[PDB]
Design an enzyme around this catalytic site. Structure first.
Site, mmCIF file in Angstrom:
data_model
loop_
_atom_site.group_PDB
_atom_site.id
_atom_site.type_symbol
_atom_site.label_atom_id
_atom_site.label_comp_id
_atom_site.label_asym_id
_atom_site.label_seq_id
_atom_site.Cartn_x
_atom_site.Cartn_y
_atom_site.Cartn_z
ATOM 1 N N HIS A 136 0.844 -1.192 0.000
ATOM 2 C CA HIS A 136 0.000 0.000 0.000
ATOM 3 C C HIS A 136 0.882 1.245 0.000
ATOM 4 O O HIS A 136 1.044 1.904 -1.022
ATOM 5 C CB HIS A 136 -0.902 0.052 1.224
ATOM 6 C CG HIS A 136 -1.777 1.264 1.245
ATOM 7 N ND1 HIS A 136 -2.128 1.909 2.411
ATOM 8 C CD2 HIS A 136 -2.360 1.960 0.238
ATOM 9 C CE1 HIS A 136 -2.893 2.949 2.127
ATOM 10 N NE2 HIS A 136 -3.050 3.001 0.815
ATOM 11 N N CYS A 143 -0.542 0.507 9.451
ATOM 12 C CA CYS A 143 -0.688 1.820 8.839
ATOM 13 C C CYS A 143 -2.076 2.128 8.288
ATOM 14 O O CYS A 143 -2.597 3.219 8.531
ATOM 15 C CB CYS A 143 0.411 2.033 7.801
ATOM 16 S SG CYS A 143 1.982 2.309 8.668
ATOM 17 N N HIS A 144 -2.694 1.197 7.576
ATOM 18 C CA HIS A 144 -4.038 1.457 7.075
ATOM 19 C C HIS A 144 -4.953 0.243 7.117
ATOM 20 O O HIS A 144 -6.051 0.262 6.561
ATOM 21 C CB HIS A 144 -4.003 2.042 5.665
ATOM 22 C CG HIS A 144 -3.135 3.255 5.548
ATOM 23 N ND1 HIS A 144 -1.808 3.162 5.195
ATOM 24 C CD2 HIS A 144 -3.371 4.565 5.817
ATOM 25 C CE1 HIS A 144 -1.263 4.366 5.257
ATOM 26 N NE2 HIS A 144 -2.187 5.233 5.634
ATOM 27 N N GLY A 145 -4.495 -0.815 7.775
ATOM 28 C CA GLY A 145 -5.311 -2.005 7.907
ATOM 29 C C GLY A 145 -5.361 -2.988 6.757
ATOM 30 O O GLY A 145 -6.448 -3.353 6.307
#
Ligand code: HEM
Ligand code: HEM
Ligand code: HEM
Ligand code: HEM
Ligand code: HEM
Ligand SMILES: C/C=C(C)/C=C/C=C/[C@H](OC)[C@@H](C)[C@@H](OC)[C@@H](C)CCc1oc2c(O)c(OC)cc(OC)c2c(=O)c1C
Ligand SMILES: C/C=C(C)/C=C/C=C/[C@H](OC)[C@@H](C)[C@@H](OC)[C@@H](C)CCc1oc2c(O)c(OC)cc(OC)c2c(=O)c1C
Ligand SMILES: CCCCCCCCO[C@@H]1[C@@H](O)[C@H](O)[C@@H](CO)O[C@H]1O
Ligand code: FES
Ligand code: FES
Ligand SMILES: [Sr+2]
Ligand SMILES: [Sr+2]
Lengths: 256, 428, 179, 179, 428, 256
Positions: C123, C143-145
């Site tokens: 990502h 960080c963002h799942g």
């Protein structure tokens, strides 16, 4: 002290068109490696640059093999290991042996005339010639005025202007009689001390002149790049100047 | 203040924008200002300076991207820039020699002013602001030169902070504050970096005001005769719009200057420099041949001309109960030489603007110029005889020019008549 | 006549040319310098690594995981339909560019015991947590799942691809050569 | 009435007070930080030093010379007259503040053999060259041309004083304690 | 421009100076501008921002004096500042929390604008320039935060450079250029330092234009009713000179703000921060609890709301042949959220300036404000249910507000009548 | 993982008026020295700060004597030597023992509530309490669920939220049963393991609580200076606000 006079060598790289001589630098690297390196280091020189264009340009695997002979203290392992081309040449082994990485730029050989520096505006700074002259300048016999007063540990050298000189060698006003002075560097070049590959002559003159060019490259690896950049720029500008000159002359004519 | 026609919004976007933020009209009036027709090649140093400032700023920001301001890495960090950073070697040499170009230009810019009386009423503010830039420039160049952390860098750093430790009383305090320690060290390097970065922006802001200053009075021309302002009719007789006339000669001039400049950077990048700064700073030894940067030489000459054995120093030492010794006298002489120059608008009593029409003036002026060259030249000579006398006579002539000669010529001198109008001069 | 209107173009053109020769290097100085580009190829001793253990190693400034998987890791890995994966490409520099995200196509050995990949979320770069974290028994990027399965395949989140596998191969009984 | 004209003062005053509390630290951050103020007191082995040899040593970021003088150096030193100097003060932190620039008042020993002083020109800081340099058998400062005699006394140039001598004393047969 | 009075040179020096450089007259017109009488406490964030910019700049320069921008020394160098530099601990905490104060203020400054239509003709340029400052501010704060080189610093650095490596095609290039290498490393830290120093000056210059912008149109007041400009007579009935009225209110406001601010720095300096940045950057592990800086949270929320399983992403993905995947969609959503806000002058079709007199408008406005808070709040929550839905509905409402609701309310909405004049409102 | 809950200790330094307890920090320094230092280091802490006001404030000669024990590779001599107060405490001897220099600032114990952080706006970050709780939380008996599955090399700790937990201790959804987890730090505090000077009790609780305060100081040495600076500033401003408020009220009254 002062700025003396050095032997004027006509190196390949001088002049706006000069360029290094790949084989010379190769020879020079050998002189440096088998002779100088014993005391001198080149801490700002990454070994891998021995491969980059504009220099000795050795083949990467050679360079890799070369870095081998050096023991380096890793930067994580804390240990010792073989030299990788990513490593810099080591620091001078001999405490008082200056670093040669920038030596060819750290010295001027064309001093003057009359502090006007007009001598360099035509002769450059003379760093390589200077270095040359120092390797040259080791006379077999000490200048007369020093006959029995040679500082033990030093050696008389005709090009060196920053060494001590026996009192018996200065004049009424303190100035030195000798052209040179006493350096702590024992003579380094003996005839055919380096076994060149292509057989080329290893006369103290030659070696000295080669190692000098090497050092000139070791200090200005981007010399050729700079001059090409320079030549290119001068060209745009010469052309651009002319156009603008005509554009300006045209534009203003409607006034005068 | 000349009679002209201002910006008139024509486009569609232009009429929308103009009624909200007349920024286009401003830019217009800045480059559509009527400028005297007779300006000569001495009026092109302003824009060479502009270029220089911009060049230094962008090359500086770029360079600051790879430079580490810490005694253990700074010198190594600059070699890294020379050997690794794409075009680093060229960016370095360009910032360096760029400095020299910056000064060669101010001196010419300055001396142009001295000769044509561009500093005389109503141009005093332009002049003063100018002087401020000059000090800023010098301070900036000084700090910049320290960053490499080479031999000349360190000792130059020592000697210049030292100047402040010569001020009676508060001296050692000011000096310890500048060094953040008992000697030149990391704390000093670290703050010089910050200030070297900051000062150029101050110069920039000052330059903005400088510009504003002469747009307010109008540029002075080689005849010292103002542009006529009684009617656009005759005003145009003396002038021509800045665009495209001067914008073009400027670019033309810039190309020629840059041509020589690039020839310098390309082929002889290290000429105007000192070989010793290619040697790492050694706090335990000062290079036998240490020497200020050429653009600093003239003032450095004035400073060391004043040793203990000089009479005027001795008189002063005695007259002030030992406060003003040689050390502090040299310092005062150096800054005084600069300060005196800043005061010329007031020391100059002649009502004639251009030195072109001043017979006696001209001799002293050229002596001044020659003196500047001579001072720069002695700066590089030793302190032995006859350089000590030469530096002394030279320093003397410098103050004599601003303090005595110019004030006096104001009365003595009988000036020639200048053209009646710029138009008349341009045509003739 | 048009010698001056030509002059304008010869000039304007010369200008623009210079303007660019000036700009390009200001831009180019920021590209990897000569010292960075010195990309090598390390070696890693694995003799120590018991199964169910991950090994993190630095390489090119980012991490590279070397996990010796358990039966469980290899099973869940294999019981997956290529049609259920978010990225079907094996992202394996060792095998073919077009290979498929099949468990076998993601390990170095056949027993499917050695999973070697860049511990760099696809990502935006973070380092996904191992030790069987996330909904899919693999890694979890905090960080963002993003979730990755026991093969390092993206199964959920904003990550668009599977953790890349670099040129990695066993140099002998117990030593993998990355790079 | 004057409650408002007082208010102005109470306000303006409060302002100026703050304005200064703000400024002082902006200024004070540049004064020697806690790690610098850590001034110690080194020791130097001299057993090696033959006479006629100078020893340069770092201390507080500046050099400190330690020269073992020759008969000649001690000779010329003593032959000078207090009235022939530029600075009559001994500038010796060991002896009395008002002592005189006499060659005995400048050495650590009585034989006048150990000259110990800061190698910091008193003019603007440079390091004067030794090895009997100059026109007075001493040191020469290349920065602006100051000469010092075999006792480190200023005899010409812009330097206003004699090279300072720091608290230095023999700790034993062969070891001086600076600081 | 409102009918006011010109500057007038009275002093002796003042007349001399004025005829040369009317800088005094300029300063005059800047702080002697007639300002509407009814401005409320929502109009004091401009000057809190001014203060913040100045505070950051001076504390920055100071801090840059002791900071070493090199991965081997940067973190150590900031502790040095906390433990050794006189008042360093305080200077650091002040620059840090200063950032937070800077943003708390823009958001209030921004939302004030959204509600009163301060972005509505003829104030579009003021607004656009404002938006530029905002981007600059964010970029600046971003780079600054990296300097300490702590855990949050490194990974924040990674994730943000990464945003550019999501641009189709040119992406990996742009990203490698920003990093000067294959990962976040010294080259990255070193250039961030240079840019962090440079950007504040750009913001400063922009602020100059920002100011110039509203001085050109006159400040908007809470009623959206312009100042009367038919005669100094009635113009003064709507206004009061900026000095001393608003200059004083401002200092008063600043004192109260600074009171809370200093209470924060003095007693709870680490509240608005992340404990993990007190841990040295580890390029081999990302803290399980990593979390953007609160002022970045709302936009970070919008970015990670868009995962693969979001149908609009699925649609977009397919309808674009896999170019616009989740990764790039999130990025476009984030910058789009900001861009959309910048376009409001055009998306807002209502001719009524102040939202005070817009009944339907208010509801949506407050929902927007609540949404901003909610977005900030979700940013710190996990990605599990129901935060994924909350972040999604929230992001949706954000674009719905600028793209759909505002354009539509322009027609639907039936507005109340606003005061006839500012005077009338002030009195009433 | 996640943020758990820690034992709330009422340290002397909390509150806008709190300040360190000089003797406590002294005791703490002893705990750290005789216990922790064996594995942990404090690389950002200059030993000489043990003397500075606002801390343990030991007498300079003591501090000088203290630095003696450490062995420091002299930055010039390259040789080993004793420790000078100008030296920093050494790096952790145990590879995986984190540095304790900032630990009390790099940990929060009051997480929440509901991500709103309203819990810290009143409870602080809880770094010292956190550290306390970890030294506390080493139970003699491993929680039930792990009976025979304890990862060899680790120890169960009720405060630790970032350790591994046996599968047999997680729930249907993967979450852990236990309040804590397994840390690689073996229990460090045994009763009366440090023979305090003034006799003060050396109960694991006490030592733990002391060493915590020490570490709080080691991370925020300028804690008191800041608060004083803070208090002072709040004062000027409260006063200045009032004046300006009245000046403004007065000034504006002439309008409305
Ligand atoms: C001395 C009383 C002592 C203290 C205090 C202490 C503290 C401590 C902390 C706060 C941690 C960090 C835990 C976290 O990441 O939240 C920690 C970690 C480890 N310790 Fe420790 N520790 C003290 C003493 C000792 C001693 C004497 C040893 C070595 C026998 C030791 C070791 C470790 C190790 C290993 C870790 C890291 C492993 C992990 O689980 O993260 N400690 N300690
Ligand atoms: C940053 C360096 C500087 C820049 C960029 C700058 C630029 C300019 C420019 C563009 C002009 C108009 C064109 C010209 O006549 O050359 C100008 C004019 C002038 N400058 Fe400067 N200048 C600088 C420094 C100085 C200095 C140091 C002085 C001397 C104190 C000075 C004195 C003047 C004067 C007197 C004029 C004449 C204005 C007039 O005729 O009304 N400038 N400058
Ligand atoms: C006012 C215009 C400026 C002048 C006169 C100036 C002058 C100088 C000088 C003389 C040096 C030494 C060059 C050398 O090494 O030979 C230097 C170095 C440097 N300058 Fe500037 N500078 C200017 C603007 C800037 C700006 C705006 C920056 C902001 C980043 C900057 C950053 C640097 C850096 C990083 C160095 C060290 C690298 C180097 O040695 O070149 N400079 N400057
Ligand atoms: C350095 C950050 C900024 C500073 C120092 C600043 C300063 C100011 C000041 C002093 C004012 C006038 C007083 C007031 O009404 O608050 C103002 C007005 C305004 N600002 Fe900013 N501003 C900044 C950023 C922004 C941003 C990011 C936006 C959002 C686009 C913005 C939008 C506005 C608007 C709409 C006005 C009203 C203009 C008018 O009434 O004509 N500003 N700003
Ligand atoms: C536009 C106003 C500015 C903002 C919003 C800003 C923001 C920041 C932020 C968020 C940090 C990280 C603070 C932390 O460590 O927790 C920082 C650090 C830093 N800033 Fe700035 N900054 C600004 C201006 C400046 C300027 C003008 C300079 C240099 C002249 C500067 C120099 C530094 C330095 C050296 C650091 C690193 C030391 C530290 O961690 O505090 N800043 N900045
Ligand atoms: C934080 C800001 C600071 C510290 C600003 C300081 C500004 C000082 C002045 O700027 C206005 C100053 C640069 C200016 O004096 C008018 C110059 C003409 C100084 C001329 C100058 O150069 C030297 C130099 O370069 C050297 O290099 C090796 C060595 C030097 O001795 C050997 C000198 C020197 O003896 C002098 C007088
Ligand atoms: C050389 C100059 C450069 C490269 C300038 C770049 C400027 C970029 C933008 O400014 C305009 C950018 C700062 C702005 O985007 C609009 C922010 C809202 C980005 C918000 C942001 O922060 C994060 C963060 O701080 C992290 O660690 C604390 C970790 C993060 O993920 C785990 C994030 C993150 O996921 C996002 C979206
Ligand atoms: C107006 C300025 C014109 C400058 C033309 C410069 C031609 C420089 O040519 C130089 C030589 O002068 C120098 O000695 C060698 C050293 O290797 O390098 C060359 O490039
Ligand atoms: S970088 Fe891994 S989820 Fe975003
Ligand atoms: S510093 Fe020694 S002569 Fe000037
Ligand atoms: Sr030659
Ligand atoms: Sr508590």
């Amino acid at each position: 002290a002062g700025g003396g006079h050095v032997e004027d060598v006509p190196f390949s790289f001088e002049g706006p068109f000069g360029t290094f001589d790949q084989h010379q630098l190769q020879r020079g690297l050998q002189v440096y490696t088998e002779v100088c390196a014993a005391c001198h280091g080149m801490k700002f020189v990454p070994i891998r640059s021995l491969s980059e264009p504009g220099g000795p340009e050795l083949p990467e695997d050679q360079v890799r093999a070369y870095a081998t002979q050096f023991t380096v203290t890793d930067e994580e392992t804390g240990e010792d290991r073989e030299g990788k081309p990513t490593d810099h040449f080591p620091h001078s082994a001999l405490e008082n042996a200056p670093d040669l990485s920038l030596m060819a730029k750290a010295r001027a050989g064309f001093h003057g005339p009359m502090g006007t520096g007009i001598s360099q505006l035509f002769n450059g700074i003379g760093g390589p010639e200077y270095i040359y002259s120092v390797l040259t300048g080791f006379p077999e016999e000490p200048p007369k005025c020093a006959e029995g007063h040679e500082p033990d540990g030093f050696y008389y050298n005709r090009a060196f202007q920053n060494g001590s000189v026996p009192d018996t060698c200065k004049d009424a006003n303190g100035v030195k009689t000798t052209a040179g002075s006493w350096i702590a560097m024992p003579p380094p070049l003996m005839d055919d001390l380096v076994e060149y590959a292509d057989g080329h002559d290893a006369s103290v003159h030659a070696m000295a002149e080669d190692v000098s060019a090497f050092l000139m490259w070791a200090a200005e690896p981007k010399l050729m790049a700079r001059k090409q950049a320079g030549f290119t720029a001068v060209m745009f500008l010469t052309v651009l100047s002319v156009l603008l000159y005509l554009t300006n002359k045209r534009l203003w004519a409607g006034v005068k | 203040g000349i009679p002209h026609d201002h910006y008139e919004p024509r486009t569609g976007i232009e009429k929308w924008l103009h009624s909200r933020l007349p920024i286009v009209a401003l830019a217009y009036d800045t480059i559509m200002i009527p400028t005297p027709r007779n300006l000569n090649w001495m009026w092109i140093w302003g824009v060479v300076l502009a270029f220089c400032l911009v060049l230094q700023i962008v090359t500086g920001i770029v360079l600051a991207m790879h430079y580490t301001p810490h005694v253990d890495l700074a010198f190594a960090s600059v070699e890294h820039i020379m050997r690794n950073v794409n075009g680093g070697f060229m960016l370095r040499y360009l910032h360096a020699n760029g400095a020299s170009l910056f000064f060669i230009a101010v001196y010419l810019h300055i001396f142009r002013g001295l000769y044509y009386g561009s500093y005389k009423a109503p141009r005093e503010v332009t002049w003063i602001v100018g002087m401020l830039i000059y000090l800023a420039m010098m301070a900036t160049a000084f700090m910049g030169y320290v960053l490499p952390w080479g031999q000349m860098s360190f000792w130059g750093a020592t000697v210049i902070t030292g100047l402040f430790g010569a001020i009676p009383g508060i001296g050692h305090s000011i000096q310890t504050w500048l060094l953040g320690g008992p000697a030149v060290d990391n704390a000093t390097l670290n703050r010089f970096f910050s200030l070297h970065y900051l000062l150029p922006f101050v110069i920039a802001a000052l330059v903005a005001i400088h510009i504003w200053a002469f747009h307010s009075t109008g540029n002075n021309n080689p005849t010292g005769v103002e542009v006529r302002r009684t009617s656009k009719a005759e005003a145009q007789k003396d002038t021509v719009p800045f665009w495209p006339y001067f914008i073009i000669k400027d670019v033309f001039a810039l190309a020629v200057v840059l041509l020589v400049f690039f020839a310098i950077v390309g082929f002889m990048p290290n000429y105007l420099g000192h070989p010793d700064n290619y040697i790492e700073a050694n706090p335990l030894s000062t290079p036998a041949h240490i020497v200020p940067e050429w653009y600093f030489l003239p003032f450095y000459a004035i400073l060391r001309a004043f040793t203990a054995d000089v009479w005027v120093v001795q008189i002063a030492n005695f007259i002030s109960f030992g406060i003003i010794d040689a050390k502090f006298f040299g310092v005062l002489a150096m800054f005084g030489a600069i300060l005196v120059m800043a005061l010329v608008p007031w020391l100059d009593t002649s009502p004639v603007r251009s030195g072109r029409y001043r017979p006696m003036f001209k001799i002293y002026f050229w002596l001044l110029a020659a003196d500047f060259v001579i001072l720069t030249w002695v700066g590089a000579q030793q302190t032995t005889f006859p350089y000590d006398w030469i530096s002394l006579i030279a320093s003397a002539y410098w103050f004599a020019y601003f303090l005595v000669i110019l004030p006096i010529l104001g009365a003595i001198e009988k000036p020639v008549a200048p053209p009646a109008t710029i138009e008349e001069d341009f045509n003739a | 006549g048009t010698r001056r209107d030509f002059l304008y173009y010869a000039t304007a053109g010369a200008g623009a040319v210079a303007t660019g020769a000036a700009v390009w290097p200001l831009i180019n100085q920021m590209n990897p310098s000569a010292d960075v580009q010195a990309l090598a190829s390390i070696f890693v001793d694995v003799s120590s690594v018991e199964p169910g253990v991950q090994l993190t190693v630095k390489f090119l400034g980012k991490p590279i995981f070397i996990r010796r998987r358990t039966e469980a890791d290899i099973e869940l890995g294999r019981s997956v339909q290529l049609g259920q994966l978010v990225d079907t490409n094996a992202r394996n520099a060792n095998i073919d560019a077009g290979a498929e995200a099949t468990d076998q196509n993601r390990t170095l050995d056949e027993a499917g015991e050695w999973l070697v990949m860049w511990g760099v979320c696809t990502h935006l770069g973070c380092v996904p947590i191992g030790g069987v974290s996330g909904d899919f028994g693999g890694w979890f990027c905090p960080c963002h799942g993003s979730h990755y399965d026991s093969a390092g395949r993206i199964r959920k989140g904003p990550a668009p691809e599977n953790l890349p596998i670099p040129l990695a191969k066993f140099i002998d009984e117990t030593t993998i050569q990355l790079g």
